[PDB]
Design an enzyme around this catalytic site. Structure first.
Site, PDB file in Angstrom:
ATOM      1  N   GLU A 127       0.774  -1.240   0.000  1.00  0.00           N
ATOM      2  CA  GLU A 127       0.000   0.000   0.000  1.00  0.00           C
ATOM      3  C   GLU A 127       0.810   1.297   0.000  1.00  0.00           C
ATOM      4  OE1 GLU A 127      -2.985  -0.544   3.122  1.00  0.00           O
ATOM      5  OE2 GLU A 127      -3.283  -2.614   2.446  1.00  0.00           O
ATOM      6  N   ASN A 169       2.298  -4.854  -3.348  1.00  0.00           N
ATOM      7  CA  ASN A 169       0.871  -5.117  -3.238  1.00  0.00           C
ATOM      8  C   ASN A 169       0.122  -3.822  -2.920  1.00  0.00           C
ATOM      9  OD1 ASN A 169      -1.212  -7.309  -2.987  1.00  0.00           O
ATOM     10  ND2 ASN A 169      -1.333  -6.582  -0.863  1.00  0.00           N
ATOM     11  N   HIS A 205     -10.257  -5.921  -2.529  1.00  0.00           N
ATOM     12  CA  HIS A 205     -11.228  -5.867  -1.437  1.00  0.00           C
ATOM     13  C   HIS A 205     -12.340  -5.071  -2.113  1.00  0.00           C
ATOM     14  CE1 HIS A 205      -8.844  -7.531   1.787  1.00  0.00           C
ATOM     15  NE2 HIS A 205      -7.840  -6.720   1.504  1.00  0.00           N
ATOM     16  N   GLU A 233      -5.900 -10.485  -1.780  1.00  0.00           N
ATOM     17  CA  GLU A 233      -6.764 -10.386  -0.603  1.00  0.00           C
ATOM     18  C   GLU A 233      -8.234 -10.254  -0.975  1.00  0.00           C
ATOM     19  OE1 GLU A 233      -5.229  -7.174   1.749  1.00  0.00           O
ATOM     20  OE2 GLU A 233      -3.150  -7.645   1.204  1.00  0.00           O
ATOM     21  N   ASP A 235     -12.145 -10.420  -1.344  1.00  0.00           N
ATOM     22  CA  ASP A 235     -13.346 -10.492  -0.535  1.00  0.00           C
ATOM     23  C   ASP A 235     -14.237  -9.416  -1.141  1.00  0.00           C
ATOM     24  OD1 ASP A 235     -11.946  -8.880   2.473  1.00  0.00           O
ATOM     25  OD2 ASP A 235     -12.568  -7.997   0.566  1.00  0.00           O
TER      26      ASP A 235
HETATM   27  O1  LIG Z   1      -7.209  -8.708  10.995  1.00  0.00           O
HETATM   28  C1  LIG Z   1      -7.081  -7.557  10.172  1.00  0.00           C
HETATM   29  C2  LIG Z   1      -6.487  -7.963   8.825  1.00  0.00           C
HETATM   30  O2  LIG Z   1      -7.436  -8.729   8.090  1.00  0.00           O
HETATM   31  C3  LIG Z   1      -6.062  -6.728   8.008  1.00  0.00           C
HETATM   32  O3  LIG Z   1      -5.368  -7.152   6.818  1.00  0.00           O
HETATM   33  C4  LIG Z   1      -5.213  -6.072   5.908  1.00  0.00           C
HETATM   34  C5  LIG Z   1      -6.461  -5.865   5.029  1.00  0.00           C
HETATM   35  C6  LIG Z   1      -6.162  -4.718   4.111  1.00  0.00           C
HETATM   36  N1  LIG Z   1      -5.055  -5.069   3.254  1.00  0.00           N
HETATM   37  C7  LIG Z   1      -3.770  -5.198   4.014  1.00  0.00           C
HETATM   38  C8  LIG Z   1      -3.975  -6.373   5.029  1.00  0.00           C
HETATM   39  O4  LIG Z   1      -2.809  -6.579   5.818  1.00  0.00           O
HETATM   40  O5  LIG Z   1      -5.180  -5.890   8.768  1.00  0.00           O
HETATM   41  C9  LIG Z   1      -5.823  -5.378   9.949  1.00  0.00           C
HETATM   42  C10 LIG Z   1      -6.181  -6.529  10.884  1.00  0.00           C
HETATM   43  O6  LIG Z   1      -6.827  -6.024  12.052  1.00  0.00           O
END
Ligand SMILES: O[C@@H]1[C@@H](O)[C@H](O[C@@H]2CCNC[C@H]2O)OC[C@H]1O
Length: 312
Positions: A127, A169, A205, A233, A235
C-alpha cells in the site's frame, strides 16, 4: 473437482487463504483450510508488529506456525508483508532519518532471512500509493524516507533472499485509474533499471456489484511489463444481512474476478482474505458491511463457492 483446491490445481493456478494460526485449533476451520486451498498467507502473523515488537527483538512464533502449517499440508507459502505503514510499532514510528531507514532495512533483512527457503513470494512493500494517484500521504516510510524507500526495501529483500519472488501489493488498483497508473509507472521504472521486482499483487477488497470491468485489461498490461500478477486479498463485501439477490451478485462477482485471472497467463492465482465470514476483517472496519467471504459464519458454502469452481 470436489474442492476449490482441485479446481485451482487443475487450472495450474493457486487458490489461497489468509490464515490466523490461532484458529487452527478449531477443527472445522482447519478442515476447510486443509482441503480447499493450495496456498496460504499469514493474515497478521508476519507483519512488523507481530515479528519485531521491540527494536531488533523478533518473535517468529506465530509466523513459524504459519510456515509449519504450509509445509505440513503441502501448500505454497506467501509472505505478507515486510514494509507497510499500518500495524507498525510505536518504537519504529519514533525513529527518523538514517535510524528509521536502518530499522526498515534490518526488519526486511531479518524477516526475509528467517523464512528463506520457506516463503515463496513476499509482499515486500504494501500500500505505497494513494487513491487518486501518487504516493500514500499517511505513511511513516513515505514521510521519513521519501520516494526511494520502495527500491531500498526490494534490494534489501533480494540481498537477504536471492530466490523469492518479490512483490509490491496494493488496493484500489484493480481497475485502470490514477492509482494503478502510478503503480504501473513504478513497476515499469524498476524493471527498466533492474531493480529486483517479480510480481504485483491486486488486493481486490471489492464491494458487491462493483467489479472493475477493465480488471483483466489492467492485469495484462502489468503482466506485459515482465512480471507475474496475483489477486492477493479477495473479498467482496455487502450490506448485512445477506439475502438471495446479494449472494447471487456476490457469486457473479467472484466469477468475474477469477476469470480475469484465468485470462492472463501470468496471473499466478487468487487468494481470498479469510475462510469464513465468522472471522472476516470486514465488519470491524466497515460497520454495517460483511458477509464478504466464500463460507458463511456457520461454514456453509455460499453461492460464491460454485462460482469460483466454474471460473477455474
Ligand atoms: O485482521 C485484520 C487484517 O485482516 C487486516 O489485513 C489487511 C487488510 C487490508 N489489506 C492489508 C492487510 O494486511 O489488517 C488489519 C487486521 O486487524
Amino acid at each position: 473437482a470436489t474442492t476449490l483446491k482441485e479446481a485451482a490445481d487443475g487450472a495450474g493456478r493457486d487458490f489461497g487463504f489468509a490464515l490466523d494460526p490461532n484458529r487452527l485449533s478449531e477443527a472445522q476451520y482447519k478442515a476447510i483450510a486443509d482441503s480447499e486451498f493450495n496456498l496460504v498467507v499469514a493474515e497478521n502473523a508476519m507483519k512488523w508488529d507481530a515479528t519485531e515488537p521491540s527494536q531488533n527483538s523478533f518473535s517468529f512464533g506465530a509466523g513459524d506456525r504459519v510456515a509449519s502449517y504450509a509445509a505440513d499440508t503441502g501448500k505454497e507459502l506467501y509472505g505478507h508483508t515486510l514494509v507497510w505503514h499500518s500495524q507498525l510499532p510505536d518504537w519504529a514510528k519514533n525513529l527518523n532519518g538514517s535510524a528509521f531507514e536502518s530499522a526498515m532495512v534490518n526488519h526486511v533483512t531479518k524477516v526475509a532471512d528467517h523464512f528463506e527457503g520457506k516463503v515463496a513470494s513476499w509482499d515486500v512493500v504494501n500500500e505505497a500509493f494513494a487513491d487518486g494517484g501518487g504516493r500514500r500521504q499517511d505513511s511513516a516510510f513515505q514521510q521519513k524516507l521519501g520516494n526511494g524507500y520502495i527500491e531500498t526495501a526490494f534490494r534489501a529483500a533480494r540481498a537477504a533472499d536471492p530466490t523469492a519472488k518479490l512483490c509490491i501489493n496494493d488496493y484500489n488498483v484493480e481497475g485502470i485509474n490514477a492509482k494503478s497508473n502510478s503503480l504501473y509507472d513504478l513497476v515499469k521504472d524498476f524493471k527498466a533499471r533492474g531493480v529486483p521486482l517479480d510480481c504485483v499483487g491486486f488486493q481486490s477488497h471489492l464491494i458487491v456489484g462493483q467489479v472493475p470491468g477493465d480488471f483483466r485489461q489492467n492485469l495484462q498490461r502489468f503482466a506485459d511489463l515482465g512480471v507475474d500478477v496475483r489477486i492477493t486479498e479477495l473479498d467482496i463485501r455487502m450490506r448485512t444481512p445477506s439475502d438471495a439477490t446479494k449472494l447471487a451478485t456476490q457469486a457473479a462477482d467472484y466469477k468475474k474476478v477469477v476469470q480475469a485471472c484465468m485470462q492472463v497467463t501470468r496471473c499466478q492465482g487468487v487468494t481470498v482474505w479469510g475462510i469464513t465470514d465468522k472471522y472476516s476483517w470486514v465488519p470491524d472496519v466497515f460497520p454495517g458491511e460483511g458477509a464478504a467471504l466464500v463460507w458463511d459464519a456457520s461454514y456453509a458454502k455460499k453461492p460464491a463457492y460454485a462460482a469460483v469452481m466454474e471460473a477455474f
